Amino acid sequence: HECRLRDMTYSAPITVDIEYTRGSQRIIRNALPIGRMPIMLRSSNCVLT
Amino acid sequence: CVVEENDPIFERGSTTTYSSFRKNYYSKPWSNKETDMFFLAISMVGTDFSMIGQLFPHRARIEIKNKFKREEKTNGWRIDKAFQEKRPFDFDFFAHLLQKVLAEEEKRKQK
Amino acid sequence: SGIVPQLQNIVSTVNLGCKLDLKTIALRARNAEYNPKRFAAVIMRIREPRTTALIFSSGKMVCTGAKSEEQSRLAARKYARVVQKLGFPAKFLDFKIQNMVGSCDVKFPIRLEGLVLTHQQFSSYEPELFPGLIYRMIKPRIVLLIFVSGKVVLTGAKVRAEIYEAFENIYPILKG
Amino acid sequence: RCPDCGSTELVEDSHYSQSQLVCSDCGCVVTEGVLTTTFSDEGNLREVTYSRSTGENEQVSRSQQRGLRRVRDLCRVLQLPPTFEDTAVAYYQQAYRHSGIRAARLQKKEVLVGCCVLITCRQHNWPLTMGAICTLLYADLDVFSSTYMQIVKLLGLDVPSLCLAELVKTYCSSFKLFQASPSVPAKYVEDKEKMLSRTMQLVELANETWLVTGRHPLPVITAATFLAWQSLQPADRLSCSLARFCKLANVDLPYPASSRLQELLAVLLRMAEQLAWLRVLRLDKRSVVKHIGDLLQHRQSLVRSAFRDLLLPPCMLKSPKRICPVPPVSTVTGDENISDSEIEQYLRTPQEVRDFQRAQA
Ligand SMILES: [Zn+2]
């Protein structure tokens, strides 16, 4: 309802843990935003369920 | 393709990072007899930073410069006292004193 | 204000009106340093006034570390005499005070945020980089480093009266 | 105006789906009908800007294009609104007008992008430390700061002060103490709102007690949130330390923060001596955190009593008996020359010259 009033989307940010190499050194991650998925109402992640 | 050459390392998880903004340049400390030999080298050669840095393999040029500036700021009286007295340039006995300082610092590290 | 600033550093340049050979003055002098691999000028240090000078082959020379204009003039004349003793027609021409840096203290703490809120167009306060506030007054064009300890450093002036008037003008701003 | 009577009291009033100008005195119209664009043609027509209808936006070097794309990706990775992107690209295009700025290295352009997005976030009350920006830049922070000072001296734009409350709001949320993840025991979990309020009160106490002036804010914020976390449960958290808390929170602890912490603890002591029950309890540096809330209840009178007995660095609080010693007046210069033996002492002897030539032969 707050998203309805404020005229903004109702989405959840995507977290990701990955691994890569910068100087041939394995650097790992734990939580990195990559985007936002719109959350359908009364879904598993929705607060209304 | 390497085989078991690098190990995984966790670094910079993309959180709020502290603003260090400091580069603490590592400077080797100064000993008592090291300060005395630096003072005698100054008195024998003058204020030539290049020559002093050449005959100081255990030190650096910027370290010698910082030490000279600190001495001129704090113990200018001793600086002038050393500059008034003169001593001829010695090479063989200077190398012998360098070896003695090497042995002394080795004994100090053994302690 | 009841407080008089203390001048600490004087910068002044002088032209010798003749060409010099840096290797000659660096080879026959004990207090001279010349390393052309990094810096192509001669560094000399005179002890009695405790000042340091830079000598260039083009004939220009600059002094630093003096406390007053008279001490800077004395150091410049000493360096001119030294250059003349090495077989060079050095002259003392076009002598003018270029810069002066002084320090002082107010003996009370100073809020570095109220100043940047009231004098934003005259200062650039960034505590994340340097603790001291940097104030730039445009009427005398003076740069001031201010600290929470109350001690203030002033620079950019040409005469002692400029430092004095800058301090007496910045004092009510710091007190308020 | 009125063509007949000359009255200039013409009023715009909405008729029955008709716009016109009429005078209120004689009721005569001077201009009726208005021409407006239709949405059927509005969606067909393409908008043209004066940045493109003048020949500009084509004299954009490959380096300027790289710089603006860097600004775009930097403001996008921070998840900033498009208004921030517009303001940042405007600031970049304004700063790129100088000849000394356009002729520079890639490091210079990158640190300029960093400083531009920093100013952009500083404008609309968006706190963001320079460390988090330098982390996303392929350069060092010293040259970044030097270029920042240079460009703020050259342009002289508005630079708001970093707000401490918003910085605390941004910094406290980065901790993982709010969620009961398997990596942290359930005893360390706390509520986000209570911890945020406690940290805000503690950083306000630090601000009013001269602990935000000069020193970096982040160590003070870390000390404040550490004291808050300890006071929330001293039964099971007083035995820990700042290093243990930073290791558990997976956050790089500031080096001076502990020292800052000590100073704050000292302040707490200077408050605990004023309260009767606390001054009878005879607390110490360790047992003072458990009453921090009480110290935050009546902090105003406590800090007033503490200041009626200021804060300065410990280097100058050693009772300086000689403050700014006056140097002796020695502005004399003799007549023309005080002495000439100084030149004889400063010159090199032929033996010394030969030794110098042999040393580095
Ligand atoms: Zn009419």
XYZ file of C-alpha atoms and ligand atoms in Angstrom:
698
model
C 0.000 0.000 0.000
C 2.912 2.355 0.693
C 4.268 1.582 -2.780
C 0.810 2.349 -4.176
C 0.747 5.713 -2.393
C 4.353 6.771 -3.076
C 4.069 5.850 -6.795
C 7.109 3.556 -6.634
C 7.777 -0.077 -7.456
C 7.512 -2.981 -4.997
C 10.668 -5.014 -5.613
C 13.334 -6.940 -3.712
C 17.086 -6.543 -4.275
C 19.009 -9.542 -5.594
C 22.061 -10.593 -3.584
C 24.840 -12.731 -5.056
C 28.038 -14.372 -3.847
C 30.659 -14.982 -6.539
C 34.373 -15.545 -7.069
C 36.745 -13.896 -9.536
C 40.390 -12.959 -10.096
C 41.916 -9.470 -10.056
C 45.663 -10.162 -10.205
C 45.381 -13.948 -10.555
C 44.224 -13.925 -6.920
C 40.950 -15.658 -6.043
C 38.677 -13.003 -4.510
C 35.290 -14.222 -3.269
C 32.096 -12.393 -2.335
C 29.167 -12.879 0.041
C 26.381 -10.430 -0.900
C 26.389 -8.111 -3.928
C 23.421 -6.275 -5.500
C 22.884 -6.921 -9.209
C 19.324 -5.680 -9.598
C 15.799 -5.721 -8.219
C 13.089 -8.283 -8.944
C 9.484 -7.026 -8.697
C 7.735 -9.057 -6.002
C 4.249 -10.296 -6.846
C 1.746 -9.852 -4.026
C 0.942 -12.809 -1.750
C 3.995 -14.684 -3.051
C 6.599 -16.567 -1.009
C 8.729 -13.472 -0.358
C 5.763 -11.086 -0.119
C 5.010 -9.739 3.348
C 1.271 -10.297 2.822
C 1.464 -14.108 2.823
C 46.535 -23.446 -16.402
C 48.287 -23.696 -13.031
C 47.766 -26.608 -10.638
C 47.091 -25.645 -7.002
C 49.104 -22.432 -7.094
C 46.758 -19.832 -5.562
C 44.525 -19.930 -2.483
C 41.095 -18.282 -2.130
C 41.070 -14.970 -0.263
C 38.093 -12.929 0.954
C 38.641 -9.197 0.458
C 36.411 -6.125 0.137
C 32.878 -7.529 0.393
C 31.550 -4.182 -0.937
C 30.485 -2.695 2.404
C 31.140 0.737 3.885
C 34.918 1.099 3.794
C 36.940 3.123 6.275
C 38.710 6.119 4.724
C 42.334 5.420 5.619
C 43.958 8.198 3.542
C 47.350 7.365 5.055
C 50.526 5.791 3.657
C 52.806 5.009 6.611
C 56.170 4.802 4.866
C 58.260 2.189 6.664
C 61.332 3.849 8.185
C 64.123 1.852 9.800
C 64.781 3.116 13.359
C 67.962 4.871 14.460
C 70.345 3.484 17.074
C 72.702 5.377 19.370
C 75.957 4.312 17.711
C 74.165 4.597 14.365
C 73.352 8.224 15.188
C 76.976 8.795 16.223
C 78.334 7.329 12.981
C 75.823 9.387 10.984
C 77.013 12.517 12.805
C 80.669 11.709 12.138
C 79.891 11.009 8.469
C 78.176 14.407 8.274
C 81.173 16.085 9.912
C 83.564 14.321 7.523
C 81.630 14.866 4.277
C 79.354 17.848 4.979
C 75.711 18.120 3.901
C 76.007 16.111 0.666
C 72.960 13.848 0.897
C 74.008 11.764 -2.124
C 77.423 10.843 -0.714
C 75.899 10.038 2.686
C 73.269 7.839 1.054
C 75.948 6.040 -0.953
C 77.963 5.100 2.151
C 74.785 4.041 4.034
C 73.661 0.716 2.512
C 71.405 0.040 5.519
C 69.529 3.349 5.125
C 67.713 5.364 2.466
C 68.136 8.837 1.006
C 64.753 10.139 2.182
C 65.438 8.721 5.653
C 68.780 10.548 5.766
C 67.021 13.734 4.641
C 64.348 13.452 7.339
C 66.995 12.732 9.980
C 69.072 15.731 8.884
C 66.016 18.000 9.002
C 65.014 16.707 12.446
C 68.565 17.256 13.702
C 68.715 20.796 12.297
C 65.387 21.482 14.011
C 66.182 19.951 17.423
C 69.948 19.740 18.092
C 71.287 22.618 16.012
C 73.958 23.171 18.663
C 75.351 19.655 18.209
C 74.989 20.079 14.437
C 77.146 23.217 14.506
C 79.610 21.553 16.893
C 80.026 18.648 14.465
C 80.303 21.011 11.489
C 83.045 23.087 13.148
C 85.315 20.088 13.723
C 86.815 18.513 10.606
C 88.279 15.084 9.899
C 89.961 13.770 6.731
C 88.135 11.334 4.480
C 88.735 7.737 5.586
C 87.883 4.692 3.464
C 89.512 1.544 4.873
C 88.891 2.362 8.538
C 85.397 3.462 7.499
C 84.759 -0.002 6.047
C 86.169 -1.538 9.234
C 83.749 0.565 11.295
C 80.923 -0.522 8.977
C 81.817 -4.168 9.615
C 81.946 -3.445 13.353
C 78.469 -1.892 13.210
C 77.274 -4.941 11.263
C 78.627 -7.253 13.967
C 77.077 -5.084 16.692
C 73.633 -5.086 15.077
C 73.906 -8.843 14.499
C 74.651 -9.343 18.202
C 71.720 -7.053 19.028
C 69.397 -9.123 16.830
C 70.697 -12.290 18.508
C 69.665 -10.868 21.896
C 43.171 41.543 19.847
C 46.102 41.551 22.260
C 47.904 38.806 20.302
C 50.664 39.381 17.738
C 51.449 36.638 15.185
C 54.948 35.190 14.867
C 56.458 35.018 11.385
C 58.214 31.692 10.822
C 59.156 31.346 7.134
C 60.110 33.866 4.443
C 60.380 33.094 0.719
C 62.155 35.572 -1.553
C 63.851 35.347 -4.949
C 66.695 37.345 -6.497
C 68.310 37.442 -9.943
C 72.101 37.442 -10.247
C 72.129 38.847 -13.789
C 74.660 36.270 -14.984
C 74.971 32.609 -15.913
C 76.359 30.059 -13.462
C 77.931 26.606 -13.698
C 76.221 24.339 -11.176
C 78.963 21.695 -11.211
C 81.638 24.262 -10.322
C 79.744 25.673 -7.337
C 78.761 22.150 -6.263
C 82.323 20.792 -6.477
C 84.108 23.563 -4.537
C 81.518 23.926 -1.746
C 80.961 21.727 1.299
C 77.370 22.810 2.047
C 76.181 22.390 -1.565
C 74.216 19.470 -3.015
C 73.549 18.823 -6.706
C 71.950 15.638 -8.081
C 70.999 16.233 -11.732
C 69.331 12.810 -11.965
C 66.349 14.138 -9.973
C 66.638 17.918 -9.468
C 68.734 20.168 -11.715
C 69.379 22.895 -9.119
C 71.894 23.407 -6.319
C 70.712 23.184 -2.703
C 72.709 25.169 -0.142
C 72.158 25.629 3.597
C 73.471 28.559 5.648
C 73.649 27.847 9.367
C 73.812 31.175 11.230
C 70.315 32.312 10.131
C 69.321 28.634 9.671
C 68.007 29.021 6.129
C 68.111 27.079 2.867
C 68.530 28.386 -0.670
C 68.027 27.000 -4.162
C 70.372 28.169 -6.926
C 69.626 27.742 -10.631
C 71.912 28.033 -13.645
C 69.699 30.743 -15.184
C 70.827 33.181 -12.471
C 67.759 33.013 -10.212
C 68.090 32.107 -6.537
C 65.452 31.606 -3.844
C 65.701 31.587 -0.045
C 63.517 29.914 2.584
C 63.461 29.645 6.365
C 64.019 33.304 7.242
C 62.088 34.990 10.048
C 62.039 38.595 8.783
C 62.717 40.505 5.581
C 66.055 41.747 6.939
C 67.237 38.206 7.693
C 66.201 37.141 4.186
C 68.152 40.068 2.722
C 71.184 39.121 4.827
C 70.970 35.506 3.645
C 70.646 36.631 0.019
C 73.706 38.869 0.380
C 75.646 36.018 2.002
C 74.776 33.695 -0.883
C 75.722 36.411 -3.381
C 79.100 36.784 -1.659
C 79.558 33.000 -1.727
C 78.803 32.892 -5.460
C 81.186 35.805 -6.060
C 83.949 33.988 -4.165
C 83.649 31.075 -6.628
C 84.540 33.307 -9.586
C 81.125 34.535 -10.731
C 79.912 38.140 -11.221
C 76.895 37.728 -8.955
C 74.777 40.821 -8.333
C 72.083 41.732 -5.805
C 69.313 43.030 -8.061
C 65.512 42.736 -8.085
C 65.013 41.711 -4.457
C 61.398 41.522 -3.288
C 59.611 39.511 -0.606
C 57.572 36.779 -2.299
C 55.787 34.964 0.541
C 55.597 34.752 4.322
C 54.203 32.004 6.563
C 53.488 32.636 10.230
C 51.896 30.902 13.197
C 49.804 32.135 16.120
C 47.354 30.911 18.764
C 44.042 32.061 20.220
C 44.074 29.892 23.413
C 40.445 28.758 23.015
C 38.807 25.967 20.995
C 37.237 26.788 17.638
C 34.184 25.138 16.069
C 35.269 24.260 12.527
C 31.653 23.602 11.449
C 30.113 26.956 12.377
C 32.782 28.698 10.308
C 32.092 26.619 7.193
C 28.354 27.123 7.745
C 28.639 30.915 8.083
C 31.637 31.438 5.749
C 31.124 28.667 3.196
C 32.145 30.915 0.288
C 35.438 31.748 2.058
C 36.550 28.309 3.290
C 36.680 24.641 2.263
C 36.407 22.414 5.347
C 37.026 18.685 4.795
C 37.721 16.801 8.045
C 37.883 13.438 6.250
C 41.149 14.488 4.551
C 42.829 17.136 6.733
C 41.785 17.993 10.314
C 42.548 21.698 9.931
C 40.017 23.974 8.268
C 41.354 25.846 5.233
C 40.111 29.444 5.057
C 40.782 31.573 1.964
C 40.150 35.278 2.512
C 39.996 37.069 -0.829
C 40.453 40.718 0.210
C 44.089 40.119 1.273
C 44.215 36.706 -0.479
C 45.423 34.921 2.669
C 45.264 31.168 3.308
C 44.737 30.114 6.927
C 45.058 26.647 8.451
C 42.911 26.482 11.597
C 42.862 23.681 14.169
C 40.720 22.705 17.142
C 43.735 23.517 19.337
C 43.285 27.205 18.466
C 46.678 27.684 16.807
C 46.328 29.206 13.338
C 48.820 29.345 10.468
C 48.665 32.208 7.962
C 50.286 32.407 4.533
C 50.097 34.313 1.258
C 51.031 37.806 2.436
C 53.758 40.126 1.156
C 54.439 42.309 4.226
C 54.137 41.849 7.986
C 51.317 44.406 8.095
C 49.253 42.136 5.839
C 49.675 39.206 8.242
C 48.792 41.486 11.162
C 45.622 42.819 9.525
C 44.581 39.331 8.394
C 44.964 38.040 11.954
C 43.121 40.998 13.491
C 40.301 40.503 10.972
C 40.032 36.733 11.461
C 40.155 37.031 15.273
C 36.543 38.272 15.743
C 35.330 35.576 13.341
C 37.020 32.886 15.440
C 35.839 34.436 18.713
C 32.235 34.692 17.507
C -5.466 46.525 -22.847
C -8.901 47.766 -23.872
C -8.904 49.130 -27.448
C -11.728 51.619 -26.793
C -11.525 52.743 -23.154
C -7.871 51.838 -22.551
C -8.469 49.810 -19.385
C -5.639 47.340 -18.754
C -7.715 45.043 -16.503
C -7.783 42.042 -18.834
C -8.377 38.726 -17.051
C -7.970 35.139 -18.248
C -11.075 33.102 -17.419
C -11.899 29.549 -18.511
C -15.028 29.603 -20.673
C -16.981 26.557 -21.853
C -13.877 24.738 -23.184
C -12.528 28.023 -24.591
C -9.660 30.304 -23.544
C -9.803 34.046 -24.209
C -8.763 37.453 -22.881
C -11.540 39.834 -21.811
C -11.678 43.104 -19.879
C -13.714 43.155 -16.669
C -14.977 46.705 -17.270
C -16.649 46.601 -20.702
C -16.658 42.834 -21.284
C -14.864 43.198 -24.622
C -12.444 40.495 -25.749
C -9.084 41.336 -27.325
C -7.827 37.842 -28.178
C -9.919 34.669 -28.344
C -8.907 31.122 -29.193
C -5.705 29.248 -28.347
C -3.704 26.714 -30.356
C -2.444 23.652 -28.476
C -0.610 20.554 -29.667
C -2.428 17.228 -29.937
C -1.161 14.076 -28.242
C -1.586 12.279 -31.574
C 1.207 14.464 -32.987
C 3.117 14.739 -29.698
C 4.059 11.054 -29.709
C 5.178 11.351 -33.340
C 7.422 14.400 -32.955
C 10.934 13.867 -31.599
C 12.398 16.255 -29.046
C 15.516 18.256 -29.913
C 17.783 19.903 -27.345
C 20.024 22.937 -27.713
C 22.926 20.663 -26.742
C 22.358 18.953 -30.121
C 20.799 21.703 -32.263
C 23.942 23.841 -31.964
C 26.654 21.418 -33.120
C 27.558 20.390 -29.566
C 27.518 16.792 -28.257
C 29.498 15.951 -31.421
C 32.754 17.566 -30.238
C 32.942 14.925 -27.497
C 36.343 13.238 -27.500
C 36.705 9.507 -26.932
C 38.231 10.418 -23.567
C 35.285 12.652 -22.656
C 32.925 9.851 -23.708
C 34.867 7.421 -21.515
C 34.668 9.896 -18.635
C 30.921 10.403 -18.928
C 30.354 6.645 -19.235
C 32.501 6.212 -16.117
C 30.313 8.757 -14.318
C 27.245 6.823 -15.477
C 28.455 3.410 -14.319
C 29.746 4.874 -11.035
C 26.385 6.450 -10.220
C 24.602 3.274 -11.363
C 26.613 0.842 -9.219
C 25.685 3.016 -6.225
C 21.984 2.577 -7.150
C 21.464 6.340 -7.426
C 18.364 7.978 -8.931
C 18.645 9.418 -12.454
C 18.602 12.955 -11.029
C 21.978 12.240 -9.428
C 23.247 11.001 -12.801
C 22.032 14.188 -14.503
C 23.635 16.428 -11.878
C 26.890 14.448 -12.019
C 27.159 14.580 -15.809
C 26.332 18.303 -15.687
C 29.106 18.889 -13.143
C 31.498 16.837 -15.279
C 30.671 18.790 -18.443
C 31.086 22.041 -16.497
C 34.461 21.033 -15.044
C 35.736 19.738 -18.401
C 35.592 23.273 -19.857
C 39.046 24.149 -18.494
C 42.121 23.668 -20.660
C 44.167 22.339 -17.740
C 41.539 19.706 -16.941
C 41.003 18.347 -20.460
C 44.768 17.860 -20.924
C 45.438 15.285 -18.224
C 46.061 11.592 -17.644
C 43.522 8.808 -17.133
C 44.179 8.843 -13.383
C 43.252 12.537 -13.365
C 40.000 11.944 -15.256
C 39.107 9.050 -12.946
C 39.735 10.983 -9.733
C 37.794 13.880 -11.274
C 34.855 11.526 -11.864
C 35.160 10.381 -8.254
C 35.183 13.935 -6.918
C 32.261 14.878 -9.179
C 30.074 12.039 -7.916
C 31.214 12.919 -4.382
C 30.026 16.512 -4.822
C 26.825 15.185 -6.417
C 26.040 13.051 -3.370
C 27.067 15.892 -1.034
C 24.546 18.215 -2.698
C 21.304 16.312 -2.039
C 22.092 15.336 1.572
C 23.426 11.926 0.508
C 26.320 10.984 2.824
C 29.085 8.935 1.219
C 32.639 8.708 2.542
C 35.571 9.209 0.188
C 36.843 5.733 1.059
C 33.832 3.981 -0.458
C 34.344 6.019 -3.638
C 38.099 5.418 -3.831
C 37.346 1.706 -3.430
C 35.575 1.823 -6.815
C 38.394 3.860 -8.409
C 41.576 2.419 -9.912
C 43.779 4.970 -8.138
C 45.193 5.990 -4.763
C 43.464 8.255 -2.259
C 46.316 10.769 -1.879
C 46.243 11.882 -5.519
C 42.436 11.791 -5.323
C 42.520 14.241 -2.408
C 45.106 16.437 -4.132
C 42.956 16.673 -7.264
C 39.883 17.309 -5.099
C 41.605 20.245 -3.400
C 42.832 21.533 -6.767
C 39.388 21.445 -8.382
C 37.631 22.968 -5.367
C 40.238 25.746 -5.418
C 39.763 26.259 -9.180
C 35.945 26.088 -9.304
C 34.886 27.031 -5.772
C 31.536 25.244 -5.824
C 29.192 24.707 -2.891
C 30.442 21.954 -0.574
C 27.983 21.105 2.235
C 29.244 19.633 5.488
C 28.954 15.899 6.096
C 26.016 15.290 8.425
C 26.816 12.996 11.347
C 23.286 11.650 11.879
C 22.866 10.567 8.257
C 26.375 9.081 8.315
C 25.434 7.039 11.391
C 22.240 5.919 9.646
C 24.297 4.788 6.644
C 27.035 3.112 8.700
C 25.042 1.218 11.347
C 22.963 -0.652 8.758
C 26.098 -2.181 7.205
C 26.494 -4.459 10.240
C 25.147 -8.014 10.295
C 24.246 -7.887 14.008
C 20.556 -7.343 13.187
C 19.978 -10.759 11.574
C 20.455 -14.057 13.417
C 22.600 -15.610 10.718
C 24.410 -18.876 11.556
C 27.741 -17.005 11.464
C 26.797 -15.004 14.595
C 25.410 -16.486 17.841
C 21.899 -15.500 18.881
C 23.267 -13.724 21.969
C 24.776 -10.941 19.840
C 21.603 -10.236 17.845
C 19.892 -6.921 18.600
C 17.154 -4.647 17.296
C 18.131 -2.191 14.567
C 16.028 0.737 15.805
C 17.277 0.634 19.405
C 20.922 0.283 18.354
C 20.518 3.103 15.824
C 18.973 5.404 18.439
C 21.703 4.576 20.964
C 24.425 5.218 18.379
C 22.774 8.509 17.390
C 22.682 9.615 21.029
C 26.329 8.614 21.490
C 27.513 10.450 18.371
C 25.542 13.512 19.484
C 27.335 13.248 22.836
C 30.632 13.055 20.939
C 29.705 16.086 18.817
C 28.815 18.231 21.831
C 32.029 17.087 23.567
C 34.455 17.973 20.721
C 34.946 14.507 19.220
C 33.963 15.154 15.580
C 36.193 18.170 14.920
C 39.456 17.292 13.168
C 39.322 13.526 13.629
C 37.789 11.259 11.016
C 34.094 10.529 11.664
C 34.121 6.782 10.909
C 36.308 5.771 13.909
C 34.059 7.783 16.233
C 30.998 6.123 14.684
C 32.553 2.685 15.194
C 33.398 3.477 18.823
C 29.854 4.747 19.409
C 28.166 1.696 17.888
C 30.552 -0.577 19.810
C 29.644 1.119 23.094
C 25.965 0.836 22.149
C 26.282 -2.884 21.381
C 28.119 -3.430 24.673
C 25.568 -1.461 26.708
C 22.688 -3.376 25.107
C 23.934 -6.517 26.900
C 26.987 -6.080 29.170
C 26.160 -9.458 30.737
C 27.405 -11.312 27.646
C 29.185 -8.542 25.701
C 31.455 -6.663 28.134
C 34.002 -9.499 27.986
C 34.488 -8.845 24.258
C 36.647 -6.139 22.674
C 36.506 -3.813 19.679
C 38.587 -6.183 17.542
C 36.277 -9.083 18.407
C 33.227 -6.973 17.530
C 34.724 -5.891 14.199
C 35.688 -9.474 13.340
C 32.171 -10.665 14.190
C 30.576 -7.853 12.164
C 32.881 -8.493 9.159
C 33.856 -4.809 9.030
C 37.395 -3.429 8.866
C 37.941 -1.641 12.173
C 39.558 1.818 12.095
C 43.014 1.987 13.645
C 42.503 5.112 15.841
C 38.947 4.092 16.735
C 40.035 2.243 19.891
C 41.933 5.348 21.003
C 38.853 7.424 20.177
C 36.859 4.857 22.157
C 39.145 5.461 25.140
C 38.539 9.208 24.888
C 34.788 8.618 24.803
C 35.139 6.315 27.808
C 36.996 9.125 29.572
C 34.072 11.430 28.783
C 31.746 8.827 30.293
C 33.893 8.855 33.433
C 33.737 12.656 33.543
C 29.966 12.203 33.457
C 29.835 9.320 35.947
C 31.613 11.459 38.545
C 28.734 13.950 38.454
C 25.900 11.478 39.079
C 25.678 10.616 42.775
C 24.973 6.888 42.498
C 27.635 6.459 39.806
C 30.261 8.445 41.723
C 29.507 6.269 44.751
C 29.698 3.105 42.618
C 33.300 4.073 41.715
C 33.167 2.778 38.154
C 36.103 2.357 35.776
C 36.805 2.277 32.046
C 35.182 -1.170 31.766
C 32.177 -0.888 34.105
C 31.048 2.499 32.739
C 29.350 1.158 29.589
C 26.568 -0.583 31.532
C 25.259 2.818 32.685
C 25.717 4.572 29.312
C 21.944 4.807 28.886
C 21.685 6.671 32.183
C 24.485 8.971 31.015
C 22.434 9.554 27.866
C 19.314 10.312 29.921
C 20.665 13.544 31.460
C 23.649 14.155 29.179
C 23.091 17.927 28.995
C 23.700 18.719 32.668
C 26.536 16.174 32.763
C 28.450 17.742 29.873
C 27.739 21.228 31.245
C 29.228 20.253 34.611
C 32.164 18.592 32.842
C 32.900 21.712 30.776
C 32.447 24.068 33.749
C 35.398 22.353 35.471
C 36.659 21.724 26.756
C 38.520 18.878 25.048
C 41.973 19.067 23.465
C 44.444 16.528 22.049
C 46.516 14.814 24.761
C 49.736 16.191 23.246
C 48.864 19.719 24.428
C 47.114 18.732 27.691
C 50.453 18.108 29.450
C 50.282 21.486 31.274
C 52.290 23.623 28.810
C 54.016 26.311 30.869
C 55.625 27.933 27.791
C 52.933 28.628 25.178
C 54.315 30.062 21.914
C 57.761 31.127 23.190
C 58.814 34.523 21.840
C 62.039 34.285 19.796
C 64.808 36.819 20.465
C 64.839 39.903 18.249
C 67.971 39.441 16.110
C 67.067 41.363 12.947
C 70.535 42.953 12.805
C 72.730 42.495 9.732
C 75.887 44.350 10.695
C 77.074 47.165 8.460
C 77.677 45.310 5.180
C 79.416 42.011 6.057
C 79.666 40.404 9.493
C 82.560 38.091 8.591
C 84.315 36.329 5.723
C 85.660 33.152 7.370
C 82.301 31.456 6.736
C 83.117 31.286 3.019
C 86.542 29.801 3.797
C 84.810 27.210 5.991
C 82.161 26.370 3.370
C 84.535 25.895 0.428
C 86.126 22.558 -0.453
C 89.887 22.043 -0.329
C 91.723 20.413 -3.261
C 92.212 17.287 -1.140
C 88.486 17.227 -0.357
C 87.651 17.736 -4.043
C 89.931 14.846 -5.018
C 88.393 12.633 -2.322
C 84.894 13.495 -3.565
C 85.889 12.703 -7.156
C 87.479 9.407 -6.080
C 84.517 8.337 -3.927
C 82.049 8.355 -6.846
C 84.532 7.852 -9.691
Zn -13.934 48.286 -22.978
